[PDB]
Amino acid sequence: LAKLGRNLTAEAREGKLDPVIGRNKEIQEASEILSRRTKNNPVLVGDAGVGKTAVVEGLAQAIVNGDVPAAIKNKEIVSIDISGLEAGTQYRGSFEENVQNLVNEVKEAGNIILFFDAIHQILGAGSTGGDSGSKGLADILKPALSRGELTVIGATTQDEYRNTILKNAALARRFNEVKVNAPSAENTFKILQGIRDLYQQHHNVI
Amino acid sequence: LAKLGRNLTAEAREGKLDPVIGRNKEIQEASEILSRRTKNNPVLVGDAGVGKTAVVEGLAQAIVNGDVPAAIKNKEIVSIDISGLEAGTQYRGSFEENVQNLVNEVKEAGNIILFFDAIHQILGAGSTGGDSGSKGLADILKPALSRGELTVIGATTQDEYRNTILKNAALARRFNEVKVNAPSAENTFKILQGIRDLYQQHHNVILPDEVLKAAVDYSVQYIPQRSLPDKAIDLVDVTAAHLAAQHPVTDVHAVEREIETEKDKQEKAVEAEDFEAALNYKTRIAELERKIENHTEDMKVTASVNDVAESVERMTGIPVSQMGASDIERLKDMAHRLQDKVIGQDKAVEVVARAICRNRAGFDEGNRPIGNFLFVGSTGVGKTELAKQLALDMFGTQDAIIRLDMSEYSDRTAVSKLIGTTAGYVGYDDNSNTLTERVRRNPYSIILLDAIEKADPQVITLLLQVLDDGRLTDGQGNTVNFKNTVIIATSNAGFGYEANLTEDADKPELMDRLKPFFRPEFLNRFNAVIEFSHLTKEDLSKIVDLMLAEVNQTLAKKDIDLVVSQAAKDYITEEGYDEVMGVRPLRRVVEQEIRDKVTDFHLDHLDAKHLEADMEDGVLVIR
Amino acid sequence: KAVEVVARAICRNRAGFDEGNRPIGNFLFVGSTGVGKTELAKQLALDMFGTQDAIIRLDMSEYSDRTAVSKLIGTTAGYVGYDDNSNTLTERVRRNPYSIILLDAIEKADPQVITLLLQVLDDGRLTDGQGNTVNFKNTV
Ligand SMILES: Nc1ncnc2c1ncn2[C@@H]1O[C@H](COP(=O)(O)OP(=O)(O)OP(O)(O)=S)[C@@H](O)[C@H]1O
Ligand SMILES: Nc1ncnc2c1ncn2[C@@H]1O[C@H](COP(=O)(O)OP(=O)(O)OP(O)(O)=S)[C@@H](O)[C@H]1O
Ligand SMILES: Nc1ncnc2c1ncn2[C@@H]1O[C@H](COP(=O)(O)OP(=O)(O)OP(O)(O)=S)[C@@H](O)[C@H]1O
Ligand SMILES: Nc1ncnc2c1ncn2[C@@H]1O[C@H](COP(=O)(O)OP(=O)(O)OP(O)(O)=S)[C@@H](O)[C@H]1O
Ligand SMILES: [Mg+2]
Ligand SMILES: [Mg+2]
Ligand SMILES: [Mg+2]
Ligand SMILES: [Mg+2]
C-alpha cells in the first residue's frame, strides 16, 4: 500500500485510533450494504463537522473487533488522498497510468476497500462539475464500478449528493446512501470527556 | 486471444457457465441470421436488466452442445471490453494500430466472432453521438462490415437502436435486429430457484419457494419502474443481507485466536520432541475446532414473507396494510385509499381509478400515454390533492411528479422573474437538460401543468404528438416515448364563493365560457376533464380533524398529546368559514393559534398527556 | 404587534413546533420610512445572530431595470439571470443558509416577481440557472 494513502486497518490493529462513541447502528448498518453481491457502494450523507469520518474509523475498529458479519472479515480499508493524487506524478498521462495501476493493485481478493472524503473531487476527468476538470477515476471507474471491480465508501454532503450523484444513472444502479445526523447533548458530553485529557498539553486545568 | 477480452467458448467447454433458462427460440433464432452468407449481423434489442447477455452465453452453451445448425459449428465467440480499449495503450495512434491489429487477428477462418454490449460506444471515432468521440472501430468497421470482414453481435437498447443504427444506411444493408422481452413469473421463479444455492454465502436460510414467489409478487406490483428479472433478484439479495441481522463474529473469533495460540505452543513442544504435550495440544485443537463448528451451524433459518415486506418498506418508505392482497383487492381498495385522504369529489376518484385499472390490467390498447386529464376549478379545493396523494399511492412516494405552472412558465415581459422570449422556452424543452433529460430518466413519472389557458403560448399542437402516440421529437431529432407517463393539467372554472350558491350554476356555465378559453380541439384530446366546484361548511369538519390528526402527529415528536373539544371544533370551523375562495384560512386559523398556546404551555412543567383544548368566548383554553 | 408576531414565530421555529419543509419566516411590513422602518433589520438581526451583519437587502423597486440611465444597465429580465447564474444571490445564500434577506418596497418595480418566489415560499427549494436547487430552510 503506502502510495498516496493510508491503511486504517493497520493503525487499528495497533490500537492507535480513538474509540468511536455513540454511533452504534449507523456504523454497522453500513455492513448491511457491503455484504451484498451487488448494489454495494454506500456513501455517508450529511453536513460537515459531524464526525463524518469517525464512522469509518469506527467501522475499522469493529472489523478488528470481530463485530462485523462474516461477509467482510478478510478485508481491509485504505483511505486515499484524492486531492493530492497529481502530487505523486509529473505528467497527467503518467498520472492516469498510475491511476489504472491502482486497479491493477486492486485484485487481492477485494481485501482492499477504497475510502475517500470528496466524491465530487472524484467525479472529475470531465465536466461533471464546473467548466472542466483534470483526469481522474471517472474515466476508469464508470466501467469498473459497473463491472463490480471496486467497492468505495463515501463521502460527501447533502447538496453534493443531489446535484452530482442522482444525475448519472450508472451510479444509480450501484450506489446507496446512509443518513448521518449530529448527536444530542449527552453523547457530545461523552466525546468531550474522552478528549479531555489531550489538553494537558496546555498546562492548564483539565 | 486474451487481449482486452475473453473467450466465452473456452469457459463453456469447461462447464464454468450457468445454464441459460427459458430462452429457447430467442437464442437459436439468432442462428437463423448467422447462417447467411450476407446480411448476418444480428443485434439484440430491448431494455436493460432482462438477461440481455444471458442470451449470448446460452448461444455459446448450445454451440458446445451441438444444438446449432452446421453453419457455425467451427466458430468461437469472444467478448470485448470496448470501453476499456484505450486502457491497453498509451497513444491513440498506437490505439488505432492495435485496433486494426484486431482485424489482422480476425483472419482465422472467421472462427472468431466479436461480441459487445454497447453499440453506441462502438459507433465512435466521430460525431455519431454527442459532440465528439475518440477513435474506434467506426473508421475501420464501416468498410470491413461492408466488405464482410467481421460478424458482430449486439447489443443495446430500443432508443439507442432507433437513434443511432437506423441513420447510417451502411449498417442498414448489413444489420438485423432481434426483439428481447422479460419473461413471466414462472421462468423467473425457475431462474431464482437455480441461483438459490449461491446465497449459502451469507450463512442464512436458503429460501423456501413461498418466500421467493412472495418476493416476485411484491416487486412486480410495487416497483414497476424496473424490469422483472433484476428487481426480483435484488429484492432477495437485500432481504438476505438484512436477515444477517448484523450479527457479530467475535463469539467464534476469540476461539480462533485461542486455536492459534495453542497451535503455536504445539509447534514449540514438537520442536522439543515432547510427544505427550503435542498430543494433548492436538486433542485441545480438535476440541476447540468442533466447538467452532457447532457455533458456525448456529445460524437462524427464517425466511418469512413478512421480513421481505419490511425490506420493501425500507425500500420505498411505504407501510403496507393488507400485505399480499390480490391486485383485485388493491384496485378496488385504492378507491377508498384516495377517497378517504380527500373529501368528496367522488367523480375524479371514479375516473382516475378506472383509468388506472385499465392501464394496469392492460385492457386498453397500447401506443397511447397512460392518462391525460384536465382539472378545472379554484385553488383552495385541495387542487393539488391528486398531485400529492395520488402520486404517492401510484409510486410509493410523492416524489414522482414534475410540475410546471405554464402561465408563469412562459415569457411575457422583461421582468426579473423571466428572461428572453416565450419562443425561447420551447427551445429549452427540446435541447437542454430540463424536460427531455428528466422524462427519459423516469419514464413513469407524472407531469403537471398548472393553469394552462393561460400564458403567451397556445401550445396545443406541439403536445398532440404525445397526445396521439407518446413519441415526440427533440431539438436534435431524437424521439422520446411517453408511454408510461401521466399528464395532468389544470385550469380555472370560475370562482365564488357565496359560498355554494354560485359554486356551480349549470353545466354549460363552464364549457361555454371555456370555449373561448380552451380550444375545443384541445378539449377533445383528453381522456377526461373534472372540475373543482367544491367549497361548503358541513363537510369541512372532516378536514378539521385531519389537521387535528397532523397536529397531534407533530406533537408526538415531543411525547405530547393534545385533546380538542367538539365546541372548539365548531368555533374553528366558524372562524375558517370565510367561505369565499377556499380552505386556506381553514388551515390558517390553527396555523399558529394552537401552537402559540402550546408554546407557553411547553414552558411548563407540563402533563403532556392532559392537554385538552376548549373554547371560552372565542379564546383557546387548554388544561 | 410586530414584536408579538416576530417573537412567537421565532419561538415556534426555535422550539421546533412548526413542521419543517418551510422557510423560517416570511413577513411583510408596510408603512412610511421615518418610523424606524429598518429597526427590525438592525436590532432583530443582531439579537438573532450576535451581529447585525447577517442581512442582505435589495430595494427591489430600484433593483430592477427601468430606463437606460446611468444607475442601471440592461433589461429587467437580465436581472433574474444575474440571480440564477452569478455570484450575487445564490452564491451568498448558500454561504450563510441562516442569513436574513430584506426586499424594500416591493410593489414596486417592473418585475411582478410573485411566482418565482413561490418555490421557496412553498418549500424553500428553488432551482438556479444551472438546475441546482438551493434550500432556504433556515433563512428569513
Ligand atoms: N463519536 C466520536 N468520537 C470521537 N470523536 C468524535 C466523534 N464524532 C466526532 N468526533 C470528532 O469530530 C471530528 C469531526 O471530523 P469528521 O467530521 O469525522 O471529519 P473531519 O475531517 O474531521 O471534518 P469534517 O466534519 O469531515 S468536514 C472528528 O475528527 C473527531 O475528532
Ligand atoms: N435465463 C436466465 N438464467 C439465469 N440467469 C439469468 C437469466 N436471465 C437473466 N439472468 C440473470 O440476470 C442478469 C441480467 O444481466 P444481463 O441483462 O444479461 O446483462 P448484465 O450485464 O447483467 O446487465 P444488463 O441487463 O445487460 S444492463 C444476468 O447477468 C443473470 O445473472
Ligand atoms: N375534496 C376537498 N375539498 C377541499 N379541500 C380539500 C379536499 N381534499 C383535500 N383538501 C384540502 O385542501 C387543501 C388545499 O390547500 P393547499 O394545501 O394550500 O393546496 P392549494 O393551495 O389548493 O394548491 P394551490 O397551489 O393553491 S392550486 C389541502 O390542504 C387539502 O388537504
Ligand atoms: N417605533 C418606532 N417608531 C418610530 N421611530 C422609531 C421606532 N423605533 C425606532 N425608531 C427610530 O426611527 C429611526 C428611523 O430613521 P432612520 O434611522 O433614518 O431609518 P429609516 O430612514 O426609517 O429607514 P429607511 O431607509 O428610510 S426605510 C431610527 O433611528 C430608529 O431608532
Ligand atoms: Mg474527518
Ligand atoms: Mg450481462
Ligand atoms: Mg391545490
Ligand atoms: Mg426605516
PDB file of C-alpha atoms in Angstrom, chain B residues 429-506:
ATOM      1  CA  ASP B 429     -37.569  21.986 -23.693  1.00  0.00           C
ATOM      2  CA  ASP B 430     -36.017  20.406 -26.752  1.00  0.00           C
ATOM      3  CA  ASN B 431     -32.226  20.780 -26.401  1.00  0.00           C
ATOM      4  CA  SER B 432     -31.493  21.211 -22.691  1.00  0.00           C
ATOM      5  CA  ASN B 433     -31.462  19.097 -19.530  1.00  0.00           C
ATOM      6  CA  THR B 434     -34.776  20.478 -18.356  1.00  0.00           C
ATOM      7  CA  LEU B 435     -37.587  18.469 -19.942  1.00  0.00           C
ATOM      8  CA  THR B 436     -36.333  15.710 -22.207  1.00  0.00           C
ATOM      9  CA  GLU B 437     -33.484  14.769 -19.873  1.00  0.00           C
ATOM     10  CA  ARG B 438     -35.862  14.166 -16.975  1.00  0.00           C
ATOM     11  CA  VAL B 439     -38.710  12.399 -18.771  1.00  0.00           C
ATOM     12  CA  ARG B 440     -36.267   9.867 -20.213  1.00  0.00           C
ATOM     13  CA  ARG B 441     -34.846   9.344 -16.723  1.00  0.00           C
ATOM     14  CA  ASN B 442     -38.184   8.402 -15.137  1.00  0.00           C
ATOM     15  CA  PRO B 443     -40.396   7.206 -17.999  1.00  0.00           C
ATOM     16  CA  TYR B 444     -43.091   6.510 -15.396  1.00  0.00           C
ATOM     17  CA  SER B 445     -43.131   9.946 -13.746  1.00  0.00           C
ATOM     18  CA  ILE B 446     -46.144  12.265 -13.686  1.00  0.00           C
ATOM     19  CA  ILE B 447     -46.061  15.753 -15.188  1.00  0.00           C
ATOM     20  CA  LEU B 448     -48.408  18.508 -14.048  1.00  0.00           C
ATOM     21  CA  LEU B 449     -49.199  21.716 -15.943  1.00  0.00           C
ATOM     22  CA  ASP B 450     -50.892  24.365 -13.824  1.00  0.00           C
ATOM     23  CA  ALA B 451     -53.489  26.769 -15.149  1.00  0.00           C
ATOM     24  CA  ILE B 452     -52.972  26.313 -18.872  1.00  0.00           C
ATOM     25  CA  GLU B 453     -55.143  28.786 -20.771  1.00  0.00           C
ATOM     26  CA  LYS B 454     -53.165  30.929 -19.734  1.00  0.00           C
ATOM     27  CA  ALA B 455     -49.840  32.216 -20.895  1.00  0.00           C
ATOM     28  CA  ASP B 456     -48.492  33.565 -24.163  1.00  0.00           C
ATOM     29  CA  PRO B 457     -48.015  30.125 -25.785  1.00  0.00           C
ATOM     30  CA  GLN B 458     -51.003  28.367 -27.327  1.00  0.00           C
ATOM     31  CA  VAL B 459     -49.180  25.040 -27.083  1.00  0.00           C
ATOM     32  CA  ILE B 460     -51.886  22.611 -28.127  1.00  0.00           C
ATOM     33  CA  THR B 461     -50.434  21.052 -31.244  1.00  0.00           C
ATOM     34  CA  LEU B 462     -46.860  20.625 -30.011  1.00  0.00           C
ATOM     35  CA  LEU B 463     -48.344  18.338 -27.368  1.00  0.00           C
ATOM     36  CA  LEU B 464     -50.545  16.419 -29.813  1.00  0.00           C
ATOM     37  CA  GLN B 465     -47.526  14.347 -30.846  1.00  0.00           C
ATOM     38  CA  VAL B 466     -47.551  12.658 -27.462  1.00  0.00           C
ATOM     39  CA  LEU B 467     -51.301  13.206 -27.130  1.00  0.00           C
ATOM     40  CA  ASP B 468     -51.595  10.959 -30.163  1.00  0.00           C
ATOM     41  CA  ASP B 469     -48.841   8.386 -29.730  1.00  0.00           C
ATOM     42  CA  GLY B 470     -46.389   9.379 -26.990  1.00  0.00           C
ATOM     43  CA  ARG B 471     -43.486   9.627 -29.447  1.00  0.00           C
ATOM     44  CA  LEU B 472     -42.223  13.186 -29.644  1.00  0.00           C
ATOM     45  CA  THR B 473     -39.105  14.609 -31.264  1.00  0.00           C
ATOM     46  CA  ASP B 474     -36.478  16.725 -29.565  1.00  0.00           C
ATOM     47  CA  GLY B 475     -34.401  19.619 -30.854  1.00  0.00           C
ATOM     48  CA  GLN B 476     -31.958  17.061 -32.245  1.00  0.00           C
ATOM     49  CA  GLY B 477     -34.449  14.777 -33.973  1.00  0.00           C
ATOM     50  CA  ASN B 478     -34.397  12.095 -31.281  1.00  0.00           C
ATOM     51  CA  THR B 479     -37.852  10.874 -30.338  1.00  0.00           C
ATOM     52  CA  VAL B 480     -38.793  10.230 -26.725  1.00  0.00           C
ATOM     53  CA  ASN B 481     -41.533   7.792 -25.776  1.00  0.00           C
ATOM     54  CA  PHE B 482     -44.196   8.877 -23.296  1.00  0.00           C
ATOM     55  CA  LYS B 483     -45.902   5.507 -22.982  1.00  0.00           C
ATOM     56  CA  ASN B 484     -45.721   5.107 -19.216  1.00  0.00           C
ATOM     57  CA  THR B 485     -46.279   8.685 -18.065  1.00  0.00           C
ATOM     58  CA  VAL B 486     -49.283  10.630 -16.812  1.00  0.00           C
ATOM     59  CA  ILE B 487     -50.081  14.209 -17.819  1.00  0.00           C
ATOM     60  CA  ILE B 488     -52.380  16.268 -15.610  1.00  0.00           C
ATOM     61  CA  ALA B 489     -53.200  19.882 -16.392  1.00  0.00           C
ATOM     62  CA  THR B 490     -55.306  22.433 -14.532  1.00  0.00           C
ATOM     63  CA  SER B 491     -57.427  25.493 -15.266  1.00  0.00           C
ATOM     64  CA  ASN B 492     -59.916  27.996 -13.818  1.00  0.00           C
ATOM     65  CA  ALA B 493     -63.604  27.057 -13.556  1.00  0.00           C
ATOM     66  CA  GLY B 494     -64.641  30.480 -12.327  1.00  0.00           C
ATOM     67  CA  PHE B 495     -64.746  31.249  -8.637  1.00  0.00           C
ATOM     68  CA  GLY B 496     -67.259  32.072  -5.946  1.00  0.00           C
ATOM     69  CA  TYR B 497     -67.852  31.776  -3.225  1.00  0.00           C
ATOM     70  CA  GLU B 498     -71.270  32.777  -1.907  1.00  0.00           C
ATOM     71  CA  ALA B 499     -70.424  30.049  -0.691  1.00  0.00           C
ATOM     72  CA  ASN B 500     -72.157  27.267  -2.599  1.00  0.00           C
ATOM     73  CA  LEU B 501     -74.901  29.458  -4.103  1.00  0.00           C
ATOM     74  CA  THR B 502     -72.646  30.216  -7.098  1.00  0.00           C
ATOM     75  CA  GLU B 503     -70.196  27.310  -6.778  1.00  0.00           C
ATOM     76  CA  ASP B 504     -71.923  25.663  -9.771  1.00  0.00           C
ATOM     77  CA  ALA B 505     -74.852  27.280 -11.591  1.00  0.00           C
ATOM     78  CA  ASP B 506     -75.118  24.967 -14.620  1.00  0.00           C
TER      79      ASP B 506
END
